[PDB]
Write a protein that binds this ligand. Structure first.
Ligand SMILES: CCC(CC)NC(=O)Nc1cccnc1
Lengths: 300, 237
């Protein structure tokens, strides 16, 4: 089990850790989060009490370093940092634990929710989407635009998701215009899976990461990416059986986790109705279709 | 974006543009089978591609053989239209290629956009105008060349005959759409109007009769009357 200590909490803030959260008070004696499960990526995220504008946060993997949070009064935010002095770090953490100055990552044992939302997500791929190589962790916030959004402005602060565009020369083979536009299997399997992602695990990891950035930061471009990657599969007549089975599970847990009150802004009516009811895979997503129909039948 | 009443004069500026109408590409007769089921028999069709400034009409004739063994013909027809129009644009010298293509039906937007990805700078636009180009097959000479074709073929016409010698392209387009609107509303009446006088003939190289300016005003009045009439006959007014 791993730990992310906090130097202090000088400003009132709601702190997220994965799918959990809690409001902390100005200068309330908070020194971090312990018992964080090893083996998964994690995200620690923030919404200040005084400006619920700009949710922001850090993706990290505790296996890659000792990380802590420290508020910066000049830049006005909680910053993640790496402590390279391992002895200094273990000493700080042990003192904070002894003084029970840390909340506990509250994983219920029956619960595979986080695993299921991050099954294919890997820090090395996050770090390619979010470019900042001097750190082992990755900052994301509400306002960051994607490379594709920038095409349609600061490149250092962009989300470099893989660009998907159904009306593009990459998507459409000369001479198969109608075939490739109505059945996107070529673009899914040859262009994206074999050509760019190499395997479906990397594709599912980017899709899962885009969902989580849409849900935790309200990042609009990430929501667009999540739906495009769903729609590309649902609009392909030829998809490996194992990918459809896994997609159904992936989407099931995403819909299960989504705040009921945000379904109006994080779910695209057109894509979901197309995917569940008109697409080639309309009959292939049984778990996802059942939870959608029972939880958000208005959208459909 | 879309072409409508507010930006109508753009049709007659000096940026090359084409209308594309696909309503006569896939044409059928519906009939009963020996067993008393219903079946369709395709007949020859045509893409109606028109430069509204010059009158140049690129009639791409769609022979029934192109449907043999194909499924979902109404959907294929839109893509075949987009395939033929993109072939026409490639066929034309760079300085003759259009800077915009206006499709008369919104279901042609995605087929055409996808076929024209090689031409990112040609704008593909819909329109809110309800244009009457479906009535092109009421022009006898166009219907004849379509129905006599035994293979695919593109025939070139000027749909304005020599009118531009005497009138502007705005006035020429207005006359054309009035004639075609009339032919669409009541073909028999409209054709009676156009041909009732045997002394006014259609030149061999023309589509419409050789009316004097004065005679066109009479004709145009008669076509307005017809359209108004039918509108009452239809709605009882
Ligand atoms: C016969 C099939 C080919 C490929 C679509 N069509 C074609 O060349 N069509 C065309 C050519 C030139 C001018 N206008 C239209």
């Amino acid at each position: 089990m791993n730990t992310v200590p906090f130097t202090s909490a000088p400003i009132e803030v709601t702190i997220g850790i994965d799918q959990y959260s809690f409001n902390v008070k100005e200068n309330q004696p908070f020194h971090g989060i312990k018992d964080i499960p090893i083996g998964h990526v994690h995200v620690i995220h923030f919404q200040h009490a005084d400006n619920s504008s700009m949710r922001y946060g850090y993706w990290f993997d505790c296996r890659m370093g000792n990380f802590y949070i420290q508020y910066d009064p000049k830049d006005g935010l909680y910053k993640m940092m790496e402590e390279r002095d391992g002895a200094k770090f273990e000493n700080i953490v042990h003192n904070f634990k002894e003084r029970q100055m840390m909340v506990s990552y509250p994983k219920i044992d029956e619960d595979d929710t986080w695993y299921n939302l991050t099954e294919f997500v890997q820090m090395d791929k996050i770090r390619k989407i979010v470019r900042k190589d001097e750190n082992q962790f990755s900052y994301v916030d509400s306002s960051m635009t994607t490379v594709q959004e920038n095409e349609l402005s600061d490149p250092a602060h962009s989300l470099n998701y893989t660009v998907i565009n159904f009306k593009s020369r990459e998507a459409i083979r000369p001479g198969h215009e109608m075939e490739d536009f109505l059945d996107k299997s070529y673009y899914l399997n040859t262009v994206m899976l074999q050509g760019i992602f190499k395997n479906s695990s990397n594709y599912f990891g980017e899709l899962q990461f885009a969902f989580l950035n849409a849900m935790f930061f309200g990042n609009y471009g990430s929501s667009l990416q999540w739906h495009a990657m769903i729609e590309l599969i649902c609009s392909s007549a030829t998809v490996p059986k194992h990918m459809l089975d896994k997609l159904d599970e992936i989407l099931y847990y995403q819909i299960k986790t989504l705040p009921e009150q945000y379904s109006d802004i994080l779910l695209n009516e057109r894509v979901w109705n197309i995917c569940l009811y008109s697409s080639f895979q309309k009959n292939s997503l049984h778990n996802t279709e059942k939870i959608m129909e029972n939880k958000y039948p208005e959208l459909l | 974006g879309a072409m409508n009443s507010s930006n109508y004069a753009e049709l007659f500026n000096n940026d090359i543009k084409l209308f594309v109408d696909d309503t006569n590409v896939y044409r059928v007769t519906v009939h009963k089978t020996f067993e008393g089921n219903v079946a369709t028999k395709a007949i020859n069709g045509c893409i109606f591609t028109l430069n509204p400034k010059t009158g140049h009409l690129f009639l791409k004739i769609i022979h029934t053989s192109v449907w043999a063994g194909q499924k979902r013909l109404s959907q294929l027809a839109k893509w075949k239209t987009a395939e033929e129009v993109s072939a026409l644009v490639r066929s034309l010298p760079k300085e003759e290629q259009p800077k915009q293509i206006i499709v008369t039906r919104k279901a042609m937007l995605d087929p055409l956009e996808v076929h024209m990805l090689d031409f990112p700078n040609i704008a593909i636009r819909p329109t809110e105008l309800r244009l009457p180009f479906s009535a092109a097959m009421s022009i006898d000479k166009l219907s004849d060349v379509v129905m006599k074709a035994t293979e695919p073929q593109m025939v070139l016409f000027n749909i304005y005959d020599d009118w531009l010698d005497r009138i502007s392209s705005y006035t020429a387009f207005s006359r054309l759409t009035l004639l075609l609107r009339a032919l669409k509303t009541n073909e028999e009446s409209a054709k009676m109007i156009l041909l009732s006088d045997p002394t006014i003939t259609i030149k061999s190289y023309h589509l419409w009769p050789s009316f004097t300016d004065e005679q066109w005003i009479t004709i145009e009045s008669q076509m307005r009357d017809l359209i108004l009439t039918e509108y009452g006959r239809k709605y009882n007014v």
